[PDB]
Each structure stands twice: as C-alpha cells, then as structure tokens.
CSV table of C-alpha atoms in Angstrom, one decimal:
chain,number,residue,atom,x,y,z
A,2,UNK,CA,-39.7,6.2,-41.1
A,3,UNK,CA,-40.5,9.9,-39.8
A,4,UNK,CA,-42.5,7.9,-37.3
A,5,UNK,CA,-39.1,6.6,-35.7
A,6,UNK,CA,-38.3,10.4,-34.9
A,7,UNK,CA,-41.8,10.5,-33.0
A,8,UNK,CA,-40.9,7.6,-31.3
A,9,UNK,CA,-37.7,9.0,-29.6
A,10,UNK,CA,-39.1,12.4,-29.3
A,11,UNK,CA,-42.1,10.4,-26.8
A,12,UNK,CA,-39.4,8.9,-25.3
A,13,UNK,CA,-36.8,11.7,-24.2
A,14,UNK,CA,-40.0,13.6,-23.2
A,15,UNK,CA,-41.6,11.1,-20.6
A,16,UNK,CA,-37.0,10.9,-19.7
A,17,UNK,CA,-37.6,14.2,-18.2
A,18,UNK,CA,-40.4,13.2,-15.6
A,19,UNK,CA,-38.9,10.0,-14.4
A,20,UNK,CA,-36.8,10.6,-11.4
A,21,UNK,CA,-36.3,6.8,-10.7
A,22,UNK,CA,-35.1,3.4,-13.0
A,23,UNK,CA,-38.2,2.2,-12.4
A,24,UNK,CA,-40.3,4.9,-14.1
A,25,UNK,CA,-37.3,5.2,-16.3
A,26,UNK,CA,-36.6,1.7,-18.2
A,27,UNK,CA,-40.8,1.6,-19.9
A,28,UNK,CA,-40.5,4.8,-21.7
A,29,UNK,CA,-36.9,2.8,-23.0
A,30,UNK,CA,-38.6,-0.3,-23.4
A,31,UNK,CA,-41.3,1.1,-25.3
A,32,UNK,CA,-39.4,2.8,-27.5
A,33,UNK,CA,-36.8,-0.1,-28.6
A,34,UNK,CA,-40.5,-1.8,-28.7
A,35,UNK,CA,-41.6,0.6,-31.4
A,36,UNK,CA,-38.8,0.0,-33.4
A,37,UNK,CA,-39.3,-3.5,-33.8
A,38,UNK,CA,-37.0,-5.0,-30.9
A,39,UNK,CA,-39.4,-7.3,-28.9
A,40,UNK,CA,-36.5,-7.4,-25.7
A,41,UNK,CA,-35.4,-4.5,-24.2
A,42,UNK,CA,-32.8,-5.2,-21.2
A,43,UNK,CA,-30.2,-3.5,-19.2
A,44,UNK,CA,-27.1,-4.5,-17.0
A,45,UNK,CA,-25.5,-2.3,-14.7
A,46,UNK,CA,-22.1,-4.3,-13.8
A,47,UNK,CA,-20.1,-2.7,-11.0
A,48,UNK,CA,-16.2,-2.0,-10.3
A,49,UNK,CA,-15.8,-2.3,-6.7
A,50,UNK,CA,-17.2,-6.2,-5.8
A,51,UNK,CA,-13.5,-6.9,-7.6
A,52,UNK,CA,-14.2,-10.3,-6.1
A,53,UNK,CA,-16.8,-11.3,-8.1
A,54,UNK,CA,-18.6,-9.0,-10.7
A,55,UNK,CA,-22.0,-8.3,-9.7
A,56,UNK,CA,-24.5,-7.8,-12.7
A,57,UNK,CA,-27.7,-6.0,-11.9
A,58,UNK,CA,-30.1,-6.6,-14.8
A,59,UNK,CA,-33.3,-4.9,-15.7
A,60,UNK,CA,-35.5,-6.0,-18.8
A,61,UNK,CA,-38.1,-7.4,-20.4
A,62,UNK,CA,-36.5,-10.3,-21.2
A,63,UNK,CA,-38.1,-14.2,-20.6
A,64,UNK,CA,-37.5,-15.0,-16.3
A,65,UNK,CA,-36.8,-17.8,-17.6
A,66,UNK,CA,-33.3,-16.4,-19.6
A,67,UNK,CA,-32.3,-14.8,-16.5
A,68,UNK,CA,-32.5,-17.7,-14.5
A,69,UNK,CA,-30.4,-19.5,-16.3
A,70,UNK,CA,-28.1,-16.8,-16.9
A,71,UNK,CA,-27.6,-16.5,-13.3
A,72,UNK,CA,-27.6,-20.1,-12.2
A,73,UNK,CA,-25.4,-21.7,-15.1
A,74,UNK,CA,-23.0,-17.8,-14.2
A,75,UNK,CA,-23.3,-16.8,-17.1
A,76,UNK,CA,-21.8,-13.1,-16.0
A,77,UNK,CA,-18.1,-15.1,-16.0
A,78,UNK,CA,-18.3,-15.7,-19.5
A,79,UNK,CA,-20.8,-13.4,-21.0
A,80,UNK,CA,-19.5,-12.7,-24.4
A,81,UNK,CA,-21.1,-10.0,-25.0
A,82,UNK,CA,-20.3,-8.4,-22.3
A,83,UNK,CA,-16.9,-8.9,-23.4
A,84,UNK,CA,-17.5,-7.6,-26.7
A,85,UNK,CA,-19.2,-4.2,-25.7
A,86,UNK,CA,-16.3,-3.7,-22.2
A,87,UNK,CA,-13.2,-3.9,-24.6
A,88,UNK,CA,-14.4,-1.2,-27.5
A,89,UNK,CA,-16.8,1.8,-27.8
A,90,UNK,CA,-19.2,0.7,-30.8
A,91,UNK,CA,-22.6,-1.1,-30.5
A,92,UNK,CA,-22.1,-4.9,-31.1
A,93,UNK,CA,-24.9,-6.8,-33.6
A,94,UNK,CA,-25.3,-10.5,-32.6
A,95,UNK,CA,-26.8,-13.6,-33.9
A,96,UNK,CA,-27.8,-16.2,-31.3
A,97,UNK,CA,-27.2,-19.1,-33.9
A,98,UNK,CA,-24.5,-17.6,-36.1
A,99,UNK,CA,-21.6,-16.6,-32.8
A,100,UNK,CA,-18.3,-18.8,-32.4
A,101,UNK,CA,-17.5,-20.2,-29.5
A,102,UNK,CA,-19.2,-20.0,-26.0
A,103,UNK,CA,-21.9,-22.6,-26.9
A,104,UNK,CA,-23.5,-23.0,-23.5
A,105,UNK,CA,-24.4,-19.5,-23.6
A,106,UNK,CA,-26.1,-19.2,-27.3
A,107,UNK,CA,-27.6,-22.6,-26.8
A,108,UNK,CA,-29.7,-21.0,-24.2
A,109,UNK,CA,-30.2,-17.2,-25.1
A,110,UNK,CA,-31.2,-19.1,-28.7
A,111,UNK,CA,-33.9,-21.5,-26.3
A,112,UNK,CA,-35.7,-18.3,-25.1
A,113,UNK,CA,-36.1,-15.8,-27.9
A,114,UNK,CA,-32.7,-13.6,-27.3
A,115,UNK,CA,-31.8,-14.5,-30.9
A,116,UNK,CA,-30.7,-11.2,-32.8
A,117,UNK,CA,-29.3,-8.2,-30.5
A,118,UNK,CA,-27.8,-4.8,-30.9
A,119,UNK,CA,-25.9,-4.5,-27.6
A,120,UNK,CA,-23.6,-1.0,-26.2
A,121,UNK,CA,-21.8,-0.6,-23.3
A,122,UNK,CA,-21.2,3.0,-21.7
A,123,UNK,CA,-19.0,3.4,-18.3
A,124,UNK,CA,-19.7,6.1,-15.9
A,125,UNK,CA,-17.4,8.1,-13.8
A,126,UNK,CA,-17.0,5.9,-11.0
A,127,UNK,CA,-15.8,2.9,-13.8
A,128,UNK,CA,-19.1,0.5,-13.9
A,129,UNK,CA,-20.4,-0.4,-17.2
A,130,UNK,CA,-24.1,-0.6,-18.4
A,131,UNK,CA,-24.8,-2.6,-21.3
A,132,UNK,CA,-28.4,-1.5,-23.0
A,133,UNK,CA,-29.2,-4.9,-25.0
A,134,UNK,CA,-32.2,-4.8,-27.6
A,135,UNK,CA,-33.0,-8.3,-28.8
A,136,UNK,CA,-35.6,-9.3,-31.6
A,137,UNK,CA,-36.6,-12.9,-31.8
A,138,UNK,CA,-37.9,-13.3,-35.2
A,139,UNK,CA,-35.7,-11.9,-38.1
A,140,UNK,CA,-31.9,-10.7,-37.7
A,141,UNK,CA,-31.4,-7.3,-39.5
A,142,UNK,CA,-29.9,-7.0,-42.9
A,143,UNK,CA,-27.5,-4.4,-43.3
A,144,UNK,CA,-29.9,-2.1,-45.4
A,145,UNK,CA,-32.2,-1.8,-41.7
A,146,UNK,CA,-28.9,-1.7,-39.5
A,147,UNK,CA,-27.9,1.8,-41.2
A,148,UNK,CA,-31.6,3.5,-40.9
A,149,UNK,CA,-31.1,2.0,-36.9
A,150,UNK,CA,-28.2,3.8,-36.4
A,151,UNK,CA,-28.9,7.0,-35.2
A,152,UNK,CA,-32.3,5.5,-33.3
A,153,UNK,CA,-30.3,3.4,-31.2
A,154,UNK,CA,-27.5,5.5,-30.5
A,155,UNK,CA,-30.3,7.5,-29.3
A,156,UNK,CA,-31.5,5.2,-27.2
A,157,UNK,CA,-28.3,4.0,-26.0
A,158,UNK,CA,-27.3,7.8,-25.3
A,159,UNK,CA,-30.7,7.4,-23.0
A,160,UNK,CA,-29.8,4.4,-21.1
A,161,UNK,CA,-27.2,5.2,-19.5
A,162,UNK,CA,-27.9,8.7,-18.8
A,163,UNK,CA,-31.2,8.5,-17.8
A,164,UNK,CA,-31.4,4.6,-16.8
A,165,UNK,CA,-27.8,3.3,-15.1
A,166,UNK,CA,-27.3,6.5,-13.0
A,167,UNK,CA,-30.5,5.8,-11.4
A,168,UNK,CA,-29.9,2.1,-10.8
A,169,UNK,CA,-26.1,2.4,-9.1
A,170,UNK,CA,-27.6,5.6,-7.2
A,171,UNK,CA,-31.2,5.9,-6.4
A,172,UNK,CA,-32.4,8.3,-4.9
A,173,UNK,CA,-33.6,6.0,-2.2
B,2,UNK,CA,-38.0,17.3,-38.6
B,3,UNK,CA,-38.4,14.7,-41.4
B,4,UNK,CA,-34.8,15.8,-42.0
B,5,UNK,CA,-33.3,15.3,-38.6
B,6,UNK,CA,-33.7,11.3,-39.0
B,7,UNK,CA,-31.8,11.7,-42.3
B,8,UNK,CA,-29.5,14.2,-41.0
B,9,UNK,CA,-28.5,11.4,-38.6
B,10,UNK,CA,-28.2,8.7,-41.0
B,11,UNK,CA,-26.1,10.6,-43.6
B,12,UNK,CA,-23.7,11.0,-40.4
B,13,UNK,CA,-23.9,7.5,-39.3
B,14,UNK,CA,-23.0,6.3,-42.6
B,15,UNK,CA,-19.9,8.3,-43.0
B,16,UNK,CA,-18.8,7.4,-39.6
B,17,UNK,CA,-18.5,3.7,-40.9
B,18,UNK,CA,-15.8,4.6,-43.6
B,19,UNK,CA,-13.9,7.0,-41.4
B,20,UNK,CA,-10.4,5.2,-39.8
B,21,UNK,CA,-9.1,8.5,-38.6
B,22,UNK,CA,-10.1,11.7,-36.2
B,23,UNK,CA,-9.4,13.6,-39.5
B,24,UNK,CA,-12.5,11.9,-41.7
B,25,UNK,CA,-14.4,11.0,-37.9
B,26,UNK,CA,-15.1,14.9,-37.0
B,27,UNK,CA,-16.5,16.7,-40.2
B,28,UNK,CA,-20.0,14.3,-39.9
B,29,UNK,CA,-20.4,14.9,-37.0
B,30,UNK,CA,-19.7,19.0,-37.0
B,31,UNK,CA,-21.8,19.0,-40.2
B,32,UNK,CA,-24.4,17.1,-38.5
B,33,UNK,CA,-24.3,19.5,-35.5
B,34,UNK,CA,-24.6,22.7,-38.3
B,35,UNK,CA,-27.7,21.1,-39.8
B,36,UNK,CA,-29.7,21.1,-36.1
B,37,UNK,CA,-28.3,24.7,-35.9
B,38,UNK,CA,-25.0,24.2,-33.9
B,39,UNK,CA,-22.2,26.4,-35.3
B,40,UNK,CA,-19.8,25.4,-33.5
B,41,UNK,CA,-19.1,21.9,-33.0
B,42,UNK,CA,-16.0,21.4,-30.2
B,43,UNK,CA,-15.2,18.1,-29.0
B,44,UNK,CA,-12.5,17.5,-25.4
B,45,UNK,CA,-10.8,14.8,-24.5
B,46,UNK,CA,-9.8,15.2,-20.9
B,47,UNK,CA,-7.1,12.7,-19.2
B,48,UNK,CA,-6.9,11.7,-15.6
B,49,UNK,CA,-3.6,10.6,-15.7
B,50,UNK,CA,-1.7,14.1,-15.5
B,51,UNK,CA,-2.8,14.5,-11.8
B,52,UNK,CA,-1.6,17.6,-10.9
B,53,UNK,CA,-3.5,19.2,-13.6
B,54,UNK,CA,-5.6,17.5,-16.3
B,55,UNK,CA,-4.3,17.5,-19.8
B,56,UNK,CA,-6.9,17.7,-22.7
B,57,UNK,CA,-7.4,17.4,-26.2
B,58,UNK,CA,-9.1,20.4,-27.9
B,59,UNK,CA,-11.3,19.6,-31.5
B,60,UNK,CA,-13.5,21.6,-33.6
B,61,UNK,CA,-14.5,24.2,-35.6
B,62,UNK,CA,-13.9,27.0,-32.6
B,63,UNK,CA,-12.4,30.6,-32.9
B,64,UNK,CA,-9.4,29.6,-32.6
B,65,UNK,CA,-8.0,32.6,-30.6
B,66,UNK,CA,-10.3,31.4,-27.9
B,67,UNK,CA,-8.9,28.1,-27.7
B,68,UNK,CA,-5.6,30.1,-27.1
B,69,UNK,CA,-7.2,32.0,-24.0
B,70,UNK,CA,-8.1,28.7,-22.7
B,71,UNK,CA,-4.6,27.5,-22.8
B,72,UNK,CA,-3.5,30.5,-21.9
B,73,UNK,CA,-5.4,31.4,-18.7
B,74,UNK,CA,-5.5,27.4,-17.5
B,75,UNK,CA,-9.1,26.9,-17.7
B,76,UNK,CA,-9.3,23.2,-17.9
B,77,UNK,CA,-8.5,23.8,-14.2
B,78,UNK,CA,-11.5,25.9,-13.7
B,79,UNK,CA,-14.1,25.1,-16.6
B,80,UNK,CA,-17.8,25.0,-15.6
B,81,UNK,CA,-18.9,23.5,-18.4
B,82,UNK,CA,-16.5,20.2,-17.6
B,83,UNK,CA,-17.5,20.5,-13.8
B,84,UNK,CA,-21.1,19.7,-14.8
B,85,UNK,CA,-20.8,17.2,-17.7
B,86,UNK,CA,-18.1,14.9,-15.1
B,87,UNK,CA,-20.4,15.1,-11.9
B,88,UNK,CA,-23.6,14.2,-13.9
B,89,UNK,CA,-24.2,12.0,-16.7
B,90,UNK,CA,-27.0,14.0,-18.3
B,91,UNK,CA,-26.4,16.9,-20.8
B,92,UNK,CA,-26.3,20.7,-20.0
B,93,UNK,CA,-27.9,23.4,-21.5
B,94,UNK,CA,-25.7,27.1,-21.0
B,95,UNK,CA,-25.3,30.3,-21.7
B,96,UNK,CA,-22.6,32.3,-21.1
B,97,UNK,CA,-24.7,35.2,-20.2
B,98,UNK,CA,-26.3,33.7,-17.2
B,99,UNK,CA,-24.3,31.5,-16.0
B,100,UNK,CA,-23.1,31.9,-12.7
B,101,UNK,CA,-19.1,32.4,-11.2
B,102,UNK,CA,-16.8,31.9,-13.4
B,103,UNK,CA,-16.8,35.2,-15.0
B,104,UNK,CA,-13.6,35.2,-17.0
B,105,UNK,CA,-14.0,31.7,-18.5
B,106,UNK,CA,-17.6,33.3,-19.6
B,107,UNK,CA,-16.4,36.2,-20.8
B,108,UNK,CA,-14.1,34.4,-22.9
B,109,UNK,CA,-16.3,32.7,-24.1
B,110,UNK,CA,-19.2,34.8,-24.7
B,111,UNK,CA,-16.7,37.2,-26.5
B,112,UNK,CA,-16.0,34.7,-29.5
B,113,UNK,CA,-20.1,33.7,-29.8
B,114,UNK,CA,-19.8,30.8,-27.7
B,115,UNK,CA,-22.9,32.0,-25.8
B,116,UNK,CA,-25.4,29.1,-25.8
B,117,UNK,CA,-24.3,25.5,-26.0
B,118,UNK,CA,-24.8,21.9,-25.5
B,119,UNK,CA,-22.4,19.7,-23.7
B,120,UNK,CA,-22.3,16.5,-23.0
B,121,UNK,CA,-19.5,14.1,-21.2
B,122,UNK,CA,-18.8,10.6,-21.3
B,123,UNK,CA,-16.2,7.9,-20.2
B,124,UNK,CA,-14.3,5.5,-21.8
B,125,UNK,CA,-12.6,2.4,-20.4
B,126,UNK,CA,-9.8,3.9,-19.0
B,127,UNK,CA,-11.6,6.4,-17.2
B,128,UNK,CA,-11.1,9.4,-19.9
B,129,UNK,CA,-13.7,12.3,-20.2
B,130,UNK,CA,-14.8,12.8,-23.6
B,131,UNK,CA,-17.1,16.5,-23.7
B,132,UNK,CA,-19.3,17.4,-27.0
B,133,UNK,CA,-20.0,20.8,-27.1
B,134,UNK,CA,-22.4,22.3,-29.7
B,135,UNK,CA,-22.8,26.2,-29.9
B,136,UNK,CA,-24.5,28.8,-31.1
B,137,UNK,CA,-24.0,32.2,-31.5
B,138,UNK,CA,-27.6,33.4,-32.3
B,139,UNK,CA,-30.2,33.2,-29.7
B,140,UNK,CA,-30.6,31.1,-26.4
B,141,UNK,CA,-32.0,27.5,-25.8
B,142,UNK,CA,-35.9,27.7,-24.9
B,143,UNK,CA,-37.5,24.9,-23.2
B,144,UNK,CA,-39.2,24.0,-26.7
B,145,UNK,CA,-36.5,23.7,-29.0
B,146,UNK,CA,-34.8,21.5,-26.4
B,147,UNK,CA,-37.9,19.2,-26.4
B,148,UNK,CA,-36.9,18.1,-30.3
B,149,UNK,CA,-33.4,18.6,-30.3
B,150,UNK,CA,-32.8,15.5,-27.4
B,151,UNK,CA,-32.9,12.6,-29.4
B,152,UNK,CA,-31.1,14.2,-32.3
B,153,UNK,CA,-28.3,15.5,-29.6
B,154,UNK,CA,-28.1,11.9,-28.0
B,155,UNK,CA,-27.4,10.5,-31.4
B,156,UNK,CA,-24.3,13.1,-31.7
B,157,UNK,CA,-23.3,12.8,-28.5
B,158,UNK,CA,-23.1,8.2,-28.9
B,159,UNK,CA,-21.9,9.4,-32.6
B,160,UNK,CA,-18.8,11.6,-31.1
B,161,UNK,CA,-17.9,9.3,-27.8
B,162,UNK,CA,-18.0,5.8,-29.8
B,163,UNK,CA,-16.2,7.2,-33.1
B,164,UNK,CA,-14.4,10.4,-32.4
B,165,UNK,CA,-13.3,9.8,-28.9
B,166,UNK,CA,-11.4,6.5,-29.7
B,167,UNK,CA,-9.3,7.9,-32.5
B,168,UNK,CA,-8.0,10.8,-30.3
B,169,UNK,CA,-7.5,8.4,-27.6
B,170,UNK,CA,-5.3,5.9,-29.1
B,171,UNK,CA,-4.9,5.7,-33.0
C-alpha cells in the first residue's frame, strides 16, 4: 500500500512538465490506472453557453459510451453530474444499484462504466470539471473506499489544477 | 514516507464523523503538523461584499497577527490570495523573498509565518476557500516539494470539500 504513495509521487512529478491537457490527462490516467480504476475520464462543463451546457470530455473511456452519451444528450440529465455540481464531496456510484434515470445506467452499465468515484471542482470563472474514475469489474467495499481516500483526493486535487485549467484555456 | 499514506487516511477517516467546522479542522491541522506544517490557517473569502471582500479566518495562527490583518485591511492587499484566485495551482512563499508588499510580509514574517503553502479553490457560489500551511523553521527546497505534492493535494481536497462547506453554510 506504500506503493500507492509512489504512484502519486510519479504522477505530480511528470504534473510539473506538462504544459498542455494533452500531456497532462496520461500521467492522471496512469495513475487512477495504478490504483485499480480501469476508466479514467474528465468533463469540463462551461458557464457561459447558458443556452445549452456544453460538456467537453477527455478519457479513456469506451467511444462507444460517449457516443451514446452525446447522441441519446445525456449532459441534460446526467446524474452524476447533478450529484457532484450541488455538494463538495466525491460521489461513489454503482451502475446497476442507482435509482431512477434508467436510460442512462442501462447504457453506462452496457459499456463497462459500472462502479465510479466521481468529484466536481469549479474554477474562478464558475465551470465545473468532474474527474470520473470507473472500474468495470468489482464495486469497492467500504474497507478499500477509506485506504482510497486520500489517493483520490489526490488525484482529484490534480485534475483540476493541472488538467481543466489547461482544457478551458490552452495555451494555444 | 510509509507514514504520509497513513497520515492521510487517519485524517480522512475523521473527516467522515465530523458534522461541524469545530471537529472538521483539527484532522486536517494535525495532518498538516505531521508533514511539518505548524501552522495550519484556512480563509474563506466572499465575493458578495463588493466593495471590499469579507473573509473568514481559521487556524492555529498567532493570533495577534490575525489582528494586524484586520487591522491594517490586508484582505484588500494580500499576495498570497492574489496568486491562489488568478491561478489554480498551489504556491510556494516565503516572506523573506517575496516581492512588494512589504508590510503584509513583515507582518507576517514577524510571527514565523515565513514559508508556506497555499492553495485556493471555489465552491458553487463562487467563494474562495485558501489553505495555508506554514512553517517557521527553514524554507521550501525544490526536493521536499517533490514529496510533499500529493500529500498537500490530499489536504488541500480534504480542507475545500469538508472544512470549506461548514464555514460556508452550517
């Protein structure tokens, strides 16, 4: 379990030398990886389209998922989404065990996103970015969320300040 | 180091069973005191006073300098704020070469908040939550910083999802 301290340490290093979200989101990625979460994805949702919320995802997550996520708009309705906007704590899902919105876990179930730990941080011009680490075999018992804790608040910390402020303002 | 993951999870856990800012700070300062922080100061700045910007002052500070910073209107002026609101990444200070702002750093410097960690993040309304950790000893090097990142990230998620709430609303 020392290992898991290695793990971040890797990751806040190779942080400091990645200038863009694209050299940004693998070190992530490979991280949440290590600590057992297959799916490693990230939304960046913006305040100004008012309109219509715009989601901007990044992940590793089945192209498959996101097509139907963005054909059946599933942004509307997301629930997690929901979950992670209205309070500050991480959110742990189950794909088959969620109430309601049964279009929506029917096909995140379908395509492996099955058991996530999702947070939401806003940034100071309002947008929220969601980091979303998804395992498709086993959900966690409670005995494995406590020793994730502080990992994932780690990571979470390193989304958005490393990840989401590089994807709603590149530097080109 | 094999400590610093269980330095974590002791604060994590008490985080779960703690309803109030009074039983939400301790972890987390005590947290910050095992990775070598002394102080541990947490600010919860408001954008709704306009004029000037109320905030919310925590932590295990000399409290005679939290008095000079009411006293002289440095949440006007602070650096440290300036930096953490402009920029989502943390900063790394000290008070002795920092530039401008030579009577918030004197201030500072003169109650051993000399070389600190500060970090700032938003909540729905558009608040500014700041966690500051500070020593009093001897300055940040570029290798200590190296270990103490994912261990500072934890505290930083720790304070803004569990300590920033309860000051904000409860």
């Amino acid at each position: 379990n020392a290992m898991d301290l290695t793990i971040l340490h890797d990751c806040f290093d190779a942080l400091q030398r990645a200038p863009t979200a694209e050299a940004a989101f693998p070190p992530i990625a490979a991280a949440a990886a290590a600590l057992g979460f297959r799916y490693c994805v990230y939304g960046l949702r913006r305040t100004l389209p008012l309109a219509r919320p715009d989601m901007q995802i990044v992940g590793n997550h089945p192209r498959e998922w996101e097509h139907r996520y963005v054909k059946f708009g599933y942004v509307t309705i997301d629930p997690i989404i929901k979950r992670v906007a209205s309070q500050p704590r991480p959110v742990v899902w189950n794909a088959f065990d969620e109430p309601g919105d049964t279009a929506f876990w029917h096909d995140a179930a379908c395509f492996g996103m099955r058991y996530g730990w999702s947070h939401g941080g806003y940034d100071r011009a309002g947008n929220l970015g969601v980091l979303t680490l998804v395992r498709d075999t086993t959900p966690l018992d409670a005995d494995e969320i406590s020793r994730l804790r502080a990992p994932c608040a780690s990571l979470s910390h390193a989304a958005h300040a490393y990840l989401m402020p590089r994807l709603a303002d590149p530097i080109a």
